[PDB]
Write an enzyme that holds these catalytic residues in place. Sequence first.
Site, PDB file in Angstrom:
ATOM      1  N   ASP A  90     -30.122  -5.961  -5.849  1.00 18.17           N
ATOM      2  CA  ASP A  90     -29.319  -5.442  -6.758  1.00 18.17           C
ATOM      3  C   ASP A  90     -29.426  -4.090  -7.354  1.00 18.17           C
ATOM      4  O   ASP A  90     -28.513  -3.511  -7.654  1.00 18.17           O
ATOM      5  CB  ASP A  90     -29.743  -6.502  -8.247  1.00 18.17           C
ATOM      6  CG  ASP A  90     -29.272  -7.930  -8.023  1.00 18.17           C
ATOM      7  OD1 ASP A  90     -28.552  -8.110  -6.934  1.00 18.17           O
ATOM      8  OD2 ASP A  90     -29.532  -8.543  -8.763  1.00 18.17           O
ATOM      9  N   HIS A 141     -15.417   7.460 -11.391  1.00 14.75           N
ATOM     10  CA  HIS A 141     -16.890   7.722 -10.726  1.00 14.75           C
ATOM     11  C   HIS A 141     -17.084   9.305 -11.067  1.00 14.75           C
ATOM     12  O   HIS A 141     -16.105  10.269 -11.061  1.00 14.75           O
ATOM     13  CB  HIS A 141     -16.479   7.418  -9.265  1.00 14.75           C
ATOM     14  CG  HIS A 141     -17.758   7.504  -8.521  1.00 14.75           C
ATOM     15  ND1 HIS A 141     -18.789   8.541  -8.384  1.00 14.75           N
ATOM     16  CD2 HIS A 141     -18.136   6.620  -7.659  1.00 14.75           C
ATOM     17  CE1 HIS A 141     -19.527   8.403  -7.580  1.00 14.75           C
ATOM     18  NE2 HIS A 141     -19.390   6.724  -7.105  1.00 14.75           N
ATOM     19  N   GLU A 162       1.017  -1.088  -0.085  1.00 11.99           N
ATOM     20  CA  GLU A 162      -0.106  -0.043  -0.185  1.00 11.99           C
ATOM     21  C   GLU A 162       0.792   1.276  -0.037  1.00 11.99           C
ATOM     22  O   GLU A 162       0.709   2.278  -0.717  1.00 11.99           O
ATOM     23  CB  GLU A 162      -0.983   0.034   1.337  1.00 11.99           C
ATOM     24  CG  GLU A 162      -1.999   1.230   1.411  1.00 11.99           C
ATOM     25  CD  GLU A 162      -1.254   2.499   1.977  1.00 11.99           C
ATOM     26  OE1 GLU A 162      -0.258   2.554   2.493  1.00 11.99           O
ATOM     27  OE2 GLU A 162      -2.127   3.516   1.843  1.00 11.99           O
ATOM     28  N   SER A 218     -25.364  26.552 -19.331  1.00 13.29           N
ATOM     29  CA  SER A 218     -26.488  26.236 -18.631  1.00 13.29           C
ATOM     30  C   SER A 218     -26.258  25.001 -17.740  1.00 13.29           C
ATOM     31  O   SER A 218     -25.740  23.920 -18.169  1.00 13.29           O
ATOM     32  CB  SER A 218     -27.459  25.936 -19.565  1.00 13.29           C
ATOM     33  OG  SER A 218     -28.607  25.833 -18.537  1.00 13.29           O
TER      34      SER A 218
END
EC number: 3.4.17.21
Lengths: 694, 694
Positions: A610, A633, A370, A574
């Site tokens: 689900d 994401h 890590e 916009s």
Amino acid sequence: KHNMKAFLDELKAENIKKFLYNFTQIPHLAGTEQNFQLAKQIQSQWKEFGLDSVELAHYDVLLSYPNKTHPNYISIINEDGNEIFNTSLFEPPPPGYENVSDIVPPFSAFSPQGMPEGDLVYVNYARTEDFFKLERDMKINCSGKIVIARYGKVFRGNKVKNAQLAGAKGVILYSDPADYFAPGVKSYPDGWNLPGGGVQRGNILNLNGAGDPLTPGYPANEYAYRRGIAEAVGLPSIPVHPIGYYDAQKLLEKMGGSAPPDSSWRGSLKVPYNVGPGFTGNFSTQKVKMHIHSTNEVTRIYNVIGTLRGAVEPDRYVILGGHRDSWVFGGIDPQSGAAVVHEIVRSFGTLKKEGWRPRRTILFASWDAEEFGLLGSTEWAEENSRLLQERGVAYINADSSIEGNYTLRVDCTPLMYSLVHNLTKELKSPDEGFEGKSLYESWTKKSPSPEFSGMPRISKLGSGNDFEVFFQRLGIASGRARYTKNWETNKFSGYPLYHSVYETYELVEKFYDPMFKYHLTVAQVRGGMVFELANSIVLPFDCRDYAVVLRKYADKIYSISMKHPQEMKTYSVSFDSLFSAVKNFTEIASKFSERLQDFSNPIVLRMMNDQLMFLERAFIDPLGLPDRPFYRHVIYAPSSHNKYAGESFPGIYDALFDIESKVDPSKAWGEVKRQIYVAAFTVQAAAETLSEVA
Amino acid sequence: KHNMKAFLDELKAENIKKFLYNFTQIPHLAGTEQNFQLAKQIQSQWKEFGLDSVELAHYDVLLSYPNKTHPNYISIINEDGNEIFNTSLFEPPPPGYENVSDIVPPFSAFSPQGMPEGDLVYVNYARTEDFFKLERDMKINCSGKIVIARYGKVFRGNKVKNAQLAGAKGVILYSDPADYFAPGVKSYPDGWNLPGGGVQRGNILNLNGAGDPLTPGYPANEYAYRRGIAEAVGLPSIPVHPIGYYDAQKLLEKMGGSAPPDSSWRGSLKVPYNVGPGFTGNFSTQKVKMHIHSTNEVTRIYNVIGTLRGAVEPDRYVILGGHRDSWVFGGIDPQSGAAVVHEIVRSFGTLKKEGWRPRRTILFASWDAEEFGLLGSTEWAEENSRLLQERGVAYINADSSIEGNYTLRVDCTPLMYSLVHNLTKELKSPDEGFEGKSLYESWTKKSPSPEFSGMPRISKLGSGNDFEVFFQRLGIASGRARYTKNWETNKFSGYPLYHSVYETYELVEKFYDPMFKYHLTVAQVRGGMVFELANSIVLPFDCRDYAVVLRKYADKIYSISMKHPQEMKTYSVSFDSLFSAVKNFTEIASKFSERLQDFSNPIVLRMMNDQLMFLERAFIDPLGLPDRPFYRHVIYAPSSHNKYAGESFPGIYDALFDIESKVDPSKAWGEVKRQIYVAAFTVQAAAETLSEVA
Ligand SMILES: *[C@@H]1O[C@H](CO)[C@@H](O[C@@H]2O[C@H](CO)[C@@H](O[C@@H]3O[C@H](CO)[C@@H](O)[C@H](O[C@H]4O[C@H](CO)[C@@H](O)[C@H](O)[C@@H]4O)[C@@H]3O)[C@H](O)[C@H]2NC(C)=O)[C@H](O)[C@H]1NC(C)=O
Ligand SMILES: *[C@@H]1O[C@H](CO)[C@@H](O[C@@H]2O[C@H](CO)[C@@H](O[C@@H]3O[C@H](CO)[C@@H](O)[C@H](O[C@H]4O[C@H](CO)[C@@H](O)[C@H](O)[C@@H]4O)[C@@H]3O)[C@H](O)[C@H]2NC(C)=O)[C@H](O)[C@H]1NC(C)=O
Ligand SMILES: *[C@@H]1O[C@H](CO)[C@@H](O[C@@H]2O[C@H](CO)[C@@H](O[C@@H]3O[C@H](CO)[C@@H](O)[C@H](O)[C@@H]3O)[C@H](O)[C@H]2NC(C)=O)[C@H](O)[C@H]1NC(C)=O
Ligand SMILES: *[C@@H]1O[C@H](CO)[C@@H](O[C@@H]2O[C@H](CO)[C@@H](O[C@@H]3O[C@H](CO)[C@@H](O)[C@H](O)[C@@H]3O)[C@H](O)[C@H]2NC(C)=O)[C@H](O)[C@H]1NC(C)=O
Ligand SMILES: *[C@@H]1O[C@H](CO[C@@H]2O[C@@H](C)[C@@H](O)[C@@H](O)[C@@H]2O)[C@@H](O[C@@H]2O[C@H](CO)[C@@H](O)[C@H](O)[C@H]2NC(C)=O)[C@H](O)[C@H]1NC(C)=O
Ligand SMILES: *[C@@H]1O[C@H](CO[C@@H]2O[C@@H](C)[C@@H](O)[C@@H](O)[C@@H]2O)[C@@H](O[C@@H]2O[C@H](CO)[C@@H](O)[C@H](O)[C@H]2NC(C)=O)[C@H](O)[C@H]1NC(C)=O
Ligand SMILES: O=C(N[C@@H](CCCCNC(=O)c1ccc(I)cc1)C(=O)O)N[C@@H](Cc1ccco1)C(=O)O
Ligand SMILES: O=C(N[C@@H](CCCCNC(=O)c1ccc(I)cc1)C(=O)O)N[C@@H](Cc1ccco1)C(=O)O
Ligand SMILES: *[C@@H]1O[C@H](CO)[C@@H](O[C@@H]2O[C@H](CO)[C@@H](O)[C@H](O)[C@H]2NC(C)=O)[C@H](O)[C@H]1NC(C)=O
Ligand SMILES: *[C@@H]1O[C@H](CO)[C@@H](O[C@@H]2O[C@H](CO)[C@@H](O)[C@H](O)[C@H]2NC(C)=O)[C@H](O)[C@H]1NC(C)=O
Ligand SMILES: *[C@@H]1O[C@H](CO)[C@@H](O)[C@H](O)[C@H]1NC(C)=O
Ligand SMILES: *[C@@H]1O[C@H](CO)[C@@H](O)[C@H](O)[C@H]1NC(C)=O
Ligand SMILES: *[C@@H]1O[C@H](CO)[C@@H](O)[C@H](O)[C@H]1NC(C)=O
Ligand SMILES: *[C@@H]1O[C@H](CO)[C@@H](O)[C@H](O)[C@H]1NC(C)=O
Ligand SMILES: *[C@@H]1O[C@H](CO)[C@@H](O)[C@H](O)[C@H]1NC(C)=O
Ligand SMILES: *[C@@H]1O[C@H](CO)[C@@H](O)[C@H](O)[C@H]1NC(C)=O
Ligand SMILES: [Ca+2]
Ligand SMILES: [Ca+2]
Ligand SMILES: [Cl-]
Ligand SMILES: [Cl-]
Ligand SMILES: [Zn+2]
Ligand SMILES: [Zn+2]
Ligand SMILES: [Zn+2]
Ligand SMILES: [Zn+2]
């Protein structure tokens, strides 16, 4: 009965203490023999504790180490070429450990080799705004200079990227006592403050979620094709080295050129904090020379993966993971987390031995490497991405359990907010003055939400830890929680002894948590979350909480854009589509919540579970964010200026950032409008996954 | 009872005939008012027939049309600049239709505008190997020339890309009687052959799966951000126009320069088929001039989407889709398919009115703008990609039902092979001489598999029709089936009247299928597949059939590489990982099949149905294939030389293609090894989705 209370009651502070002691006696650096033997120990113990299967998953990844016989150091060199001052070759080891042998000296992992020599420029924290102030306001050019920056505020890899783009030929990082020495507390070993010889280790990569630099996209297994080093992902292009404040003072005290622009640039050392370039009159012919000889080397790493098979939905996975590799002894980072994971596994295993199984499968992970850029979790997720994206319910991280003793700190997806509030309401506060009160009550009092009264603060996820691949790449609901300090401006700086040789068992046991009660509270929060995620009939996710934050984030990004009203009129910019999508999401989420409460039918249940599980997955764009293909994401990403911080609507935020400096405003505002469309589309598409299915 | 036999018995040849007649009386070009009114009619009728919901989904996409007041044509121009021969401005309309008004004249959709004038080079079918022969063997340079190519063998968009890369300044496409005039049959209206004034329309895009050129990745909805035309995806860069063989003969007859290199370059016209460049001695000063004035215009299109909700698993979708837009009357393409879809919907609706529902949801789609590059299906799939990838079981295409009357033709995923074999065994053959025999028996006799005796041929999926986005991008199991001719070398050329004004109801009713019995057989195959996919308890997918073909494809790609043994020794190019992955897939698939046969438990059933459904999805690489990000399937892709054909292990195939001509063999062989790793990894990862889940 086998319910959550049975699970939680089985957790013991004394076991966490025993495990922390066991995990922190010798260094466990990624890729070393010591860390492999600990992996083997954990695998054995997890089997003993009752898991169904425990395997090691190994990968061969790029790591970085100093050269044992050619040490890294920095000099001040006179005009003749004599080195008149040298920085330390090692941190003075703590009492009783002065005979441990494989303590890696302080270095910046993945620094290239070099011996640049030049004039110093001091760049404060080397943040984007510090470089704007230097170059745009003070008119100081960093090209061909060595930059010196204090650690703190943002991820050190962002500092180095900023320095590179400013044209620096090297970076020296140092720990200023303003950031790493709390007033009125003593230096280690007599208190928890950083001594002047202490140094923060850490990688300086800018991987943007790629994992192993040589194999982006694919696991670094036995037959993997590797990029050549020249095409590796994320490696810095200039040498970098960290030092302590004793050494920093020697480098800063001679600095001349311009005064610091204001007091936010001055630390606590007895120096002027002049920005430079170079030294004052008498010393103007002296230079600074770096000597960095570290090598990048492909090295095997080992993850331990334990499975507890679900009784009813074995093809749904709740994952509790944290890393095991440390820079030196890892007294807080990560062994305070790993000891908590070990006791959680032990507790789940006790229930299992009595005939209980969770409803869903629980996977437990002890990640390797890590510290070298999330390499173990990322490679395993690349190898298992098909299983994870079709079966992954949630990921709960478990790195350091404590970084202070004041209150709880939580970052998670909005889908987990209600689960966290509910759980902390059922847990006892460990805090002095709150005996008999819930953790929710103490946490809310000490860490109030800026928006809603009577609610605690929960932050956004960015990067900096092993949840990154599960959430930012794969779109699996993720969370993390730890005990923290009362020191707001230091929330991204680390505790004083972060990544130093002084982070020991004794540090924790004497100064942080002598009764291991904060560790226990954190075990109950992480373990309690995992228990509920793996055992609730209906997944404990509330889509209405996403609707609330999406509106907040839309208002926020709108307000940033509205600092440029003339351009918004000119280019017809916009936000109507985005607000429309958010309004739709709110309406659909409300109807879905009513159906969820108001549906014996296990197909409708699972169909509905689900829909809850794939809701996080709906925010993933398979094309990724601009020039960051592994951050997919659309609502969240690690901030492009600070990997540790999460940013919302990151595509739009980055398109608007410093937009008034762009030389083709038509093109820049075009790209803002493109990102508004991508965000509005993705919010609407996510909302539509909650509609009736047919 | 409501079983498959009830469904199949309700289908009637006479209804298909009535629907075909109804759909082919006026042109239905994408983006025209006529095609919108047909969309509205279909939506109404689908509601009448009994569907639960029927909606139009509209998008605003880039289309291309000729200029009504500035027609496209080609000239032969003398040295003075007089145009001494002009190609036709329209196809002579068929008997009784000489008063229809909105017949679009022949053009190549998406050609840019221009008036290039130059010398002709004849390039045979303009395939990759034809250009190799010209440039490498015959030493003819196409730079700055107008190329003339015969239609046939490969997708016309590949011809144009090949011509562009050869440096041509324009392309003339023509239909040679060798490819479009079967000996011994008369020209339309007295037989099914192409008359000399007939012309094949068609788009010449190279979109690589992107859909609308202006919005790759995202649906072309009301707020979409569009690329500027300059950055549009897939548009040709030189003008292109198609002509008939009467006009072709006038252009070819004067050709000089080099003789055709061999007889595979000569068609059936009474010309030498000289390659050029330019005309013979007396005519050497004449040139060819193109006049193309077509315009690209963003235009609204309409898909009709009908839903029949599943009784048990409404969140699982079986999709039957085919397009509705046509070049002119669409007698075969697509209305022979659409009429079949209409009768299928009618039959399912009849069962529904009696109280039956399928187990899973069935979606029915009438796609728009297929002829302009699969635009309607691709945009809808971009809008619904989150629902489709988590819920899509299978896609069955339904474009033209007949392109001949000889035997069945099927292309599908290996997962459907057993379903197709089983279904055709239960259906009656319509063929003369096979009365009382199964369709499987006639199809196997007329179209034997090259590999396995007593088995019929089933081909690979590439592109060319609306299944492309569901299979190549999203990894949803897909299939298609139609009745075809006995004309092997013409399998990618189209039937003679393909995309001509002569494709009418009368063509079908007089010459292809007077009793509509081939249409009915195709309705039973497509409808029967959909019925089984939507109603079987266990999904009717056999993973062992994938294992068998993966071994075949591995042996195939190995054998291509082994034509270069010295390079394989030098660069250490091993296929061992790929064969290992395939062997693993075979073993795991076998164990999974045993569990599937050997497991009352609906969670295990659905868990197992999810493993079968996500198996196709496991072959998707989220990084896509090299420079084709919308082709993401690692086992299959549309051939880079012929969009109509599927290629296996396309990443490796393209890395090896013409590798002996690459100037840096180290780099080229490196990329072969990278693609072997990506394929071996993906096969292993797909295999692991079939392992026990915990
Ligand atoms: C939030 O959810 C709502 C549904 O409640 C969803 O509403 C949809 O809005 C779209 C985009 O505005 C509507 O699209 C219109 O559809 C009609 C036919 O139904 C068309 O005629 C319209 O086109 C005409 O008008 C346009 C606008 O001036 C012109 O540009 C165009 O050229 C035509 O003249 C238009 O396409 C759609 O009908 C509704 N659907 C409903 C009400 O069910 C909304 O879009 C969602 N928000 C987001 C961000 O998705
Ligand atoms: C097909 O399925 C099989 C399982 O049946 C799977 O087998 C795995 O093969 C890998 C790669 O060969 C094996 O990896 C080895 O693992 C051991 C520890 O278990 C390591 O010690 C090995 O490393 C040493 O040897 C290497 C090779 O010479 C050296 O390069 C290395 O430096 C070390 O000295 C090696 O990594 C793995 O053990 C098996 N797993 C089993 C048998 O369960 C196989 O890979 C699958 N095929 C594909 C394409 O995935
Ligand atoms: C966190 O805890 C709160 C408080 O327990 C949970 O909200 C509550 O959840 C229950 C179960 O859905 C709701 O009960 C339902 O009430 C309606 C009556 O309107 C009834 O129709 C249902 O049969 C059911 O009894 C309850 O209203 C609700 N309380 C609220 C919203 O204040 C919440 O679900 C928990 N969050 C989790 C587990 O993520
Ligand atoms: C296509 O049709 C064939 C022939 O019907 C199908 O294969 C058959 O499928 C059945 C059901 O799985 C198998 O029956 C099983 O047999 C074993 C005995 O070993 C028993 O343990 C089970 O309880 C069950 O009765 C049968 O063996 C099998 N026949 C074969 C392989 O020759 C095939 O499934 C169909 N394909 C589809 C629907 O995709
Ligand atoms: C600073 O160090 C340099 C380099 O010394 C080497 O590396 C050191 C960190 C340490 O490991 C030493 O033992 C190494 O010799 C010193 O300069 C060297 O001095 C030696 C002995 O006088 C000489 O033979 C070398 O050539 C010098 N090397 C260089 C690169 O200049 C220097 O004296 C040290 N400065 C101070 C103030 O201590
Ligand atoms: C070939 O056509 C050209 C162009 O004619 C125009 O476009 C045609 C396809 C058709 O629509 C005509 O009605 C159009 O006038 C002819 O050349 C033109 O001839 C006219 C009348 O003599 C003259 O005024 C124009 O300037 C010419 N235009 C050009 C571009 O040269 C030509 O005669 C035709 N050739 C043959 C053999 O029929
Ligand atoms: O050290 C860390 N992470 C430490 C960072 C401590 C600094 C405080 N930072 C925070 O981001 C933080 C801490 C707790 C919470 I609940 C939420 C956020 C940690 O997450 O505990 N990761 C490594 C490895 C890495 C990979 C990518 C970026 O960093 C590093 O920073 O060097
Ligand atoms: O016309 C078609 N498709 C026709 C192609 C007829 C040529 C024969 N080609 C085949 O690929 C074929 C036909 C049947 C089977 I079962 C399997 C393959 C069709 O699939 O029936 N598509 C358009 C639109 C398009 C989009 C992308 C590429 O082409 C075109 O080719 O112009
Ligand atoms: C940490 O705890 C482990 C587990 O108790 C210890 O490893 C065991 O050591 C004993 C004595 O040498 C052996 O008999 C066992 O085989 C070991 N068990 C394992 C590896 O599962 C280890 O000694 C402890 N480490 C420290 C530093 O105290
Ligand atoms: C194709 O069939 C449709 C449906 O039968 C016909 O449309 C109908 O026309 C009648 C007579 O004008 C109307 O009363 C109905 O309202 C229409 N029904 C619809 C649109 O659902 C259409 O006329 C036929 N077309 C051709 C070319 O024969
Ligand atoms: C480390 O430095 C030593 C001593 O000078 C040298 O011999 C060796 O090559 C280096 N090791 C590396 C670069 O890995
Ligand atoms: C900084 O210095 C270098 C030359 O030493 C120069 O090329 C660069 O343009 C300078 N930048 C500014 C902003 O002055
Ligand atoms: C533990 O809490 C006490 C009391 O507030 C504080 O004085 C002490 O310094 C804390 N320890 C740490 C490491 O924050
Ligand atoms: C089509 O050509 C006409 C007639 O010359 C012209 O006036 C008009 O601009 C063109 N239409 C286009 C380019 O769309
Ligand atoms: C083809 O012709 C052009 C110049 O007219 C030239 O630039 C190009 O290199 C030529 N190619 C070959 C292979 O002769
Ligand atoms: C239909 O089949 C007959 C008999 O084999 C054949 O002669 C006829 O040409 C076929 N029609 C077409 C369009 O292939
Ligand atoms: Ca990797
Ligand atoms: Ca699009
Ligand atoms: Cl954590
Ligand atoms: Cl088809
Ligand atoms: Zn850590
Ligand atoms: Zn750390
Ligand atoms: Zn078609
Ligand atoms: Zn067509």
